[PDB]
Design a binder for this molecule. Structure first.
Ligand SMILES: [Zn+2]
Ligand SMILES: [Zn+2]
Ligand SMILES: [Zn+2]
Ligand SMILES: [Zn+2]
Ligand SMILES: [Zn+2]
Ligand SMILES: [Zn+2]
Ligand SMILES: [Zn+2]
Ligand SMILES: [Zn+2]
Lengths: 150, 150
């Protein structure tokens, strides 16, 4: 039937140790994003869906730009002017552990906007939610492909 | 634009070291499957698309069973009686390097049979191409999710 769940295991790019799992679950109000990552420098990291489910490059550049089927500007999750892939920042604690849970009202699992087969990228720096086209989040520290869950 | 290419980076399950990249490219005659893997025990390894793009489990069991949207029997790539996910065996050389190239006439990138967001599983043992429902290929040595390529 209709995909209710997506799963993304992220793997570090060259010179990083960032790992973890992101799950996407259909909720009444949209899609519940739950991320559990480790090996991050403490503080805020850009947390995005990129347009290619291609994590073959050593530095994650194969994932391409932000997933942007609506051809909009880069912004914050709460902005109307955002990429579908703009999931904001994930915060790592003093031990490099990062937990995020929020409800996204734009991401879907079917049709032109479907995130299935796209990539998750975690960035080295904070997404400032304003600078075009990526929020100045800098290098890619981890990459994974979003798959169909059950 | 219609997806012309899919990419799958495989990562080992916990007790293994198997890595590599699999590409799927639309050709005139079907889909060209190209696999380049390393860290395999020499000999033949079951090489399958599984139904869930979920590589979160320690042992790859999260990937579920064979991708089988037609509800058919397990077989060889050349068989009419096969799962969409039945891509046969990949052979590793004496150094653990494995190359496979063949044209698959069943796998597609859109609709009910789409392999996008499904998993690749590499098995410890040979797929015997006959035993139901999995070809008796034994443990899962590597898992990856099939993503959209540029
Ligand atoms: Zn946790
Ligand atoms: Zn990004
Ligand atoms: Zn963006
Ligand atoms: Zn569109
Ligand atoms: Zn299998
Ligand atoms: Zn099968
Ligand atoms: Zn070849
Ligand atoms: Zn069907």
């Amino acid at each position: 039937g209709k995909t209710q769940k997506a799963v993304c295991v992220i793997y570090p790019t060259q010179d990083y140790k960032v790992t973890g799992v992101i799950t996407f679950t259909k909720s009444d109000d949209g899609v519940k994003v739950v991320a559990d990552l480790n090996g991050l420098s403490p503080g805020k990291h850009g947390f995005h869906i990129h347009e290619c489910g291609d994590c073959s490059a050593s530095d994650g550049t194969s994932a391409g730009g932000h997933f942007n089927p609506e051809e909009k500007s880069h912004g914050a999750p709460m902005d109307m002017s955002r990429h579908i892939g703009d999931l904001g920042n994930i915060t790592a604690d003093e031990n490099g552990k990062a937990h995020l849970e929020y409800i996204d009202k734009m991401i879907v699992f079917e049709g032109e906007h479907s995130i299935i087969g796209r990539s998750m990228i975690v960035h080295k720096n904070e997404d400032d939610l304003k600078t075009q086209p990526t929020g100045n989040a800098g290098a890619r520290v981890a990459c994974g492909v979003i798959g169909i869950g059950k």
